[PDB]
Design a protein around this ligand. Sequence first.
Ligand SMILES: Nc1ncnc2c1ncn2[C@@H]1O[C@H](COP(=O)(O)OP(=O)(O)O)[C@@H](O)[C@H]1O
Ligand SMILES: Nc1ncnc2c1ncn2[C@@H]1O[C@H](COP(=O)(O)OP(=O)(O)O)[C@@H](O)[C@H]1O
Ligand SMILES: Nc1ncnc2c1ncn2[C@@H]1O[C@H](COP(=O)(O)OP(=O)(O)O)[C@@H](O)[C@H]1O
Ligand SMILES: Nc1ncnc2c1ncn2[C@@H]1O[C@H](COP(=O)(O)OP(=O)(O)O)[C@@H](O)[C@H]1O
Ligand SMILES: Nc1ncnc2c1ncn2[C@@H]1O[C@H](COP(=O)(O)OP(=O)(O)O)[C@@H](O)[C@H]1O
Ligand SMILES: [Mg+2]
Ligand SMILES: [Mg+2]
Ligand SMILES: [Mg+2]
Lengths: 45, 95, 257, 259, 255, 255, 253, 235
Amino acid sequence: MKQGLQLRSLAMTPQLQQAIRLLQLSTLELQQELQQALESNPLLE
Amino acid sequence: ELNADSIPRLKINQQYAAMGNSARNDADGQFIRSNLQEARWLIKSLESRNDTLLRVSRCIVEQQQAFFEQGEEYMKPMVLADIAQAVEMHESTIS
Amino acid sequence: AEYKDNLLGEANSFLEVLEQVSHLAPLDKPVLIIGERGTGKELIASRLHYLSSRWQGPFISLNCAALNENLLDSELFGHEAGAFTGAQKRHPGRFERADGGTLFLDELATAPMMVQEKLLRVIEYGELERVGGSQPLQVNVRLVCATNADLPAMVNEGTFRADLLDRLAFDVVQLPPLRERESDIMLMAEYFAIQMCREIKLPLFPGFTERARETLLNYRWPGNIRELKNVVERSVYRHGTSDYPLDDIIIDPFKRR
Amino acid sequence: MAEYKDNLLGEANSFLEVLEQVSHLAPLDKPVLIIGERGTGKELIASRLHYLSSRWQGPFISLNCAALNENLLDSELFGHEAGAFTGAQKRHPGRFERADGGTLFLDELATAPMMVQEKLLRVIEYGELERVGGSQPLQVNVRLVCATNADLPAMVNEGTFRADLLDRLAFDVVQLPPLRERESDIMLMAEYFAIQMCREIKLPLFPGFTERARETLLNYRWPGNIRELKNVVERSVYRHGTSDYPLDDIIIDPFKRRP
Amino acid sequence: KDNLLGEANSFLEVLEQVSHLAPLDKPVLIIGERGTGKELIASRLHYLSSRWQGPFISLNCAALNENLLDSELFGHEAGAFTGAQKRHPGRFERADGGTLFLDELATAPMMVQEKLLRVIEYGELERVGGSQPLQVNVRLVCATNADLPAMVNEGTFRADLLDRLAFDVVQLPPLRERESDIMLMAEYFAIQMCREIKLPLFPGFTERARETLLNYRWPGNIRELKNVVERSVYRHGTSDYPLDDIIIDPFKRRP
Amino acid sequence: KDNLLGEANSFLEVLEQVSHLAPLDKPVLIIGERGTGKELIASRLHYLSSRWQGPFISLNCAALNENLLDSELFGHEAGAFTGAQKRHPGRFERADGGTLFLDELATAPMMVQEKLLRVIEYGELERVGGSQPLQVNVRLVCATNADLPAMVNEGTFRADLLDRLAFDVVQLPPLRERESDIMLMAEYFAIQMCREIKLPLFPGFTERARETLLNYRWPGNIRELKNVVERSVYRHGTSDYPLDDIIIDPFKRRP
Amino acid sequence: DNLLGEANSFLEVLEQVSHLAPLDKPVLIIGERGTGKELIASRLHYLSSRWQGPFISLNCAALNENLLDSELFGHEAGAFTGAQKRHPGRFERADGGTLFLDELATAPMMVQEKLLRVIEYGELERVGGSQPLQVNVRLVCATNADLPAMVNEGTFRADLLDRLAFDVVQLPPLRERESDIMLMAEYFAIQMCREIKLPLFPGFTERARETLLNYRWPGNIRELKNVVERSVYRHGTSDYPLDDIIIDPFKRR
Amino acid sequence: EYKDNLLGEANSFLEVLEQVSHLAPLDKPVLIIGERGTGKELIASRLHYLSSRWQGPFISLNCAALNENLLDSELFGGRFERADGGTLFLDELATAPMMVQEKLLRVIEYGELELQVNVRLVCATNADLPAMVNEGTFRADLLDRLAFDVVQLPPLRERESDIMLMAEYFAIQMCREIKLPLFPGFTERARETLLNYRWPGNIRELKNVVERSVYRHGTSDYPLDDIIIDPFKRR
Ligand SMILES: Nc1ncnc2c1ncn2[C@@H]1O[C@H](COP(=O)(O)OP(=O)(O)O)[C@@H](O)[C@H]1O
Ligand SMILES: Nc1ncnc2c1ncn2[C@@H]1O[C@H](COP(=O)(O)OP(=O)(O)O)[C@@H](O)[C@H]1O
Ligand SMILES: Nc1ncnc2c1ncn2[C@@H]1O[C@H](COP(=O)(O)OP(=O)(O)O)[C@@H](O)[C@H]1O
Ligand SMILES: Nc1ncnc2c1ncn2[C@@H]1O[C@H](COP(=O)(O)OP(=O)(O)O)[C@@H](O)[C@H]1O
Ligand SMILES: Nc1ncnc2c1ncn2[C@@H]1O[C@H](COP(=O)(O)OP(=O)(O)O)[C@@H](O)[C@H]1O
Ligand SMILES: [Mg+2]
Ligand SMILES: [Mg+2]
Ligand SMILES: [Mg+2]
């Protein structure tokens, strides 16, 4: 109602932002990107 | 229905997942953990994309069922903010 | 086009009122009412919205009573961002609810006079009074009202300023009293008997004794429709009532033993 | 320049002269106050001055006085944001702060709190800026508009309105010709609203005006000047009838139960 | 730091009081009706004070936010439930020997009264969640429209305020009392007005109505004087516009 | 120890009472008119008391905003509170081991008293998110111009708590009741202003002004004393002519 | 295990109190104005199985903000990390021992409503800590100057009070007994004289005591304490017996 | 079954029990009328005990009131998740926040923001809800959708004859717990006092009075004639 004290988060930028930006892409755009990325990771299938 | 076959699946190499904790070397474990975190972030990103797409698609198909049924001649004025308000879709991740 | 749901409005004056509504339906101006209690008025308001058959939703449905703090109905013209604490993004709501539509004014007489003044200030020019620093924005939507409150009485009271009162003067409706309607009442009585028999899907509509309908008539019946709906389920509450006709209608929920 | 009055529902009696005086007063930006009755063209006069918002860049600012609820109204005066209130957000300055140079249309409600009006008056008298904080007031000019809907010197005697606020206000008033006074284009603006109503109805043609109806129109107390006249006009228009009869019954009192 | 002097011997003595007080930083009151120009004289003292290059800027007592009263004189440092920022002190903290004319003191909350009663204590500025207070010298000055004893008999302001009353509140003479340069004040005000009116000069002028205005209520010394001056001028706006039949009655029904 | 204005026999009795009271770490309060300056006596005592060195607290009553002692006295140095967190300095936390003069506690919320009661009686409090309350070694002090004898009689104090807030109150005599150190106060004021005004010499006051003081009922006493000092400062005039007419009723408009 | 007055009826009440003291059923503790007989509960808890058990006490006047997570169950999960930095809620602090409440008659009766539930097996679940409780930590409350007519006055929930206790706690009037008057008087006198580093007790006039024996005992034990202190300071001299009784520091000369 | 605690020999208690037993088979939402402490939710205990979905986790548990964002996190996770499939409780229904009450009612059927879990909601209220509707303190829509079929409770004044039996039962349980050798015996003075004992509460009042009375008695050999009652107060 009025004003006094009380009241109270945040998101992430850069890395989370890059991951999110990858999804606005096309379907096969995401697929080729996934292939290129999986080319590196030794802990993924 | 989401094209699940056209939906890629991100699998984590479980053999590496079982070959890092036993690593008495800290550098290998740290690199493995960082790779796992990045891969989990990527898989979660793809999954979130798929889920938001499914929700917004349900909203639009509800909105564009007349466009789906009668056709483009009966294609209703459909907008993202209206669709986002109608289906509680993402306010900016959707955009 | 879209057809309004059936209403037992058998009163000849009720038919006349329906006709007046029908004439007003192409028209688009304020629509007020005498707000008979226990009498299903905004159902008629919906039949109106339905008669308009506007694309999208123009049949907003919100009263005034829950707007206990002034802030609530104040937020019928919501908040944009950061006025007071922003608990959620774009606190705006209930205003675009009939984006290109109309407003149903229920519990209207209880509204604050300051709230009333704000509402009227919105009425003509249409400016968006969003709490917090911003620019207004109109919208081609309407409004409508229905209340047992006596408008001349409140004008004597001055509860709301006269400007708004006249600003609302575009269509009135005096609903018949519950004690006023009798034949339509028994008609809707059988109607609700059948409707309950349908919705519950009980095997048999029991019926009602002639004594049953007569005693229901001897009932206070303060609400012709609202009380009848409660009585409907009250008899539907009884188990095995559907198999054989019974005059067991539960008036008082507190009635026991 | 001059913009066509989108409405000139004006009175040849003296609202012609009233409008002339307004036009003469228009060029300056000094204190601007008016006066009138319940629903008596006073918004329309507001539009008159807003057209008289000379040149361009007439930032129309509306001060719906009986609004603003109770609490944050104070901020609506000055300016929110910073980290101040229960929230934090970008500088939504007060409504007066939000408009710099704009036209300050007073809603002639007469606020219950004289001090709140005085706080607005102190900002209204001059703006020194709020470099300390947006909680304060800033360095803004504005065109300002007032009007009257009640008895001013009475309230001065009644203590309802502070004399100092009154002294700053009403440098040049603008009273209005009541329905009991203006009474000029009664039939004229009557048929004006009638034509507007027919065009809205997409109507075939105006059936006309009854001599009994015109006599009643002359006899009308007209509790509301501008709108209530238009109100009853709409009342008859909705009442409507065959094109055979020019006018039928009286729409002055729709409240009355329908025959 | 000056204006259209009302040109009064009383005004002379009041200016004398101001000049005598000029170096002093003692807290000061005033009881002036609208159009008195005491605020203008107050700020004239502020610029002409010993602290000529001092930070001198008022803040209407009516201004403060309902809860921000502590945030009024002091200013936010840490926490406060904001969760961010809130590191800016108060304009009163921003004073430090400077001036903030306590205008509107006639109406501040008794709550506001007592919080200031703390401010009347020498130094010791406390902020939210604070460590150590600030003893920050600041020049104090105020003006009111009403009678301090009247409020006192009402008990309207606590006698703590009367303690806060420190320098002898000079008072503006009434309009009927001032009656000093009415024609001359009219002349200067009308010079300014015709400048704004952009008309060449007052060919009408005349002064019989000037004496008639000498028989006027003049509720505001400058609030009404010049107000009515402009009202009549704008109703005229013609070169040959004299002091005859020009009325101060904007509320009243003219013909 | 400290500059004490006055050498009255009742004042001497009060001073001896202070001497006796000095060991009594037990909190009590003082009753005096506004502008009494008893706080100064309390401070001189506290320095001369067991805390020959300790903390010192001013603690204006009207100084909190819906904010607990862990936001007011205890402090939220233990952070982790709702909203953001940090290290938060705390008054009663800081005070422990010092001098805690409560300021004009008469005007205090019932909630304030609600906290302070347990804060004092056991002397263990806890804070914003703490394990244990510990205890404070500070000196709990207070005074207010009100006569709580009617306040808690009105209920305006938790008379139980306020009594428990007290051990053996001390109240200074009224100066108008004292009616003695008029000359000495006058002389001290004359010298003090002559320094302050950078004056050459004190003109002195006629015995007429002495008799005016003899009639100066002086509702402010030490406050009125300084008020009279202000009167003299404005009435500085000339050091050669002794101050003739001292009594300045500023609320009386001159001329 | 403490110093305090005693009377025959007071002794009987203390006996019944000890009889209840090992028992874990909570009872309602009502005291004289100048009683603060909290030490009695302290004995009772020692006389309870919590002789080594928990003994957390809080006064229900000291809250913080509209609601306090620490008041029942809270931690540092306001936003962002959401970490139970101090999961230990009030009952979590007080689990398995004396949960003592003061300032009872004087909080938001909504908090009483809230209390009723925690009173019933806690089951408090915070973001910091989620637990069904029902942990038999010794429950007791005080600051009972209020009356059930306050429920008639509508101060709080009569149901909450009714479910609060099954057995009582009384407080004989201080103006009633006046038996150990000189006794505890000399006791406090010596305690202060040691605290005052005073030489010795010079005695007091029997007339002084008898005049002092006339008092309503409005502050009971607290009145005794403050009165003794004031009389001692007024004596200011262990030379002659204290023939003076300081009736009220509310006084003048 | 679950121990014949508060086994109401008042045949009215039996009839209420029979209606509840019928409702026990039903998985539809439900509520009961009574006063808490005057038998707080004892029927709720019976219903959970008489859970036909016996393995169904009747976590239930809704007498109290939590915080604001607490209602936010509970409705949008506890709520149906707190008692998935199982029975849903509700009490102090007069204590719900308007936002909270709206959230609950919407979950019962559906909401308007732009579903739920479990079956067999169970509730009860301690005050006259119709007056609250007259006061306008909630949604009457919720009131109706809730008001399908109820379970009233007999008043303490109404609970008259079996009171001696309930008192004896409380005595048995107490002496078992109190380690007292035996219920020292019924006395005409005590029975008459209980008859006069208006006992605004039913269960809590009688139980607390008996607790005080037995603690006073302390003599399993010596019966108590006319033990007074008070669970608090000074002397
Ligand atoms: N034709 C209908 N079909 C279903 N429900 C109806 C109908 N007419 C009335 N009602 C019911 O009657 C209730 C109250 O009606 P009404 O008397 O119009 O409200 P009010 O008391 O505001 O006038 C509503 O909840 C509505 O569901
Ligand atoms: N020529 C016109 N053009 C537009 N509206 C008009 C005209 N003549 C009358 N009206 C109507 O009459 C009313 C004028 O009074 P208004 O300014 O609204 O009342 P108030 O003086 O209480 O503020 C409005 O409803 C306005 O729409
Ligand atoms: N000496 C002066 N010369 C010119 N204008 C003055 C003078 N004194 C006052 N004024 C006018 O008075 C107005 C300020 O009003 P003011 O008298 O300060 O009200 P109040 O005294 O109630 O605060 C200003 O617009 C200013 O032009
Ligand atoms: N013992 C004293 N001797 C001389 N002047 C004193 C003495 N005590 C107070 N004063 C004077 O009285 C005023 C003190 O007022 P203040 O400390 O605010 O009193 P209060 O106890 O009412 O808060 C100052 O002007 C100070 O010089
Ligand atoms: N019988 C007794 N004889 C002496 N002192 C007692 C006795 N009972 C209690 N006291 C003490 O008297 C004091 C009463 O004051 P206080 O603690 O403020 O009471 P309360 O907690 O009721 O406000 C406490 O120190 C308490 O321990
Ligand atoms: Mg209705
Ligand atoms: Mg002014
Ligand atoms: Mg206490």
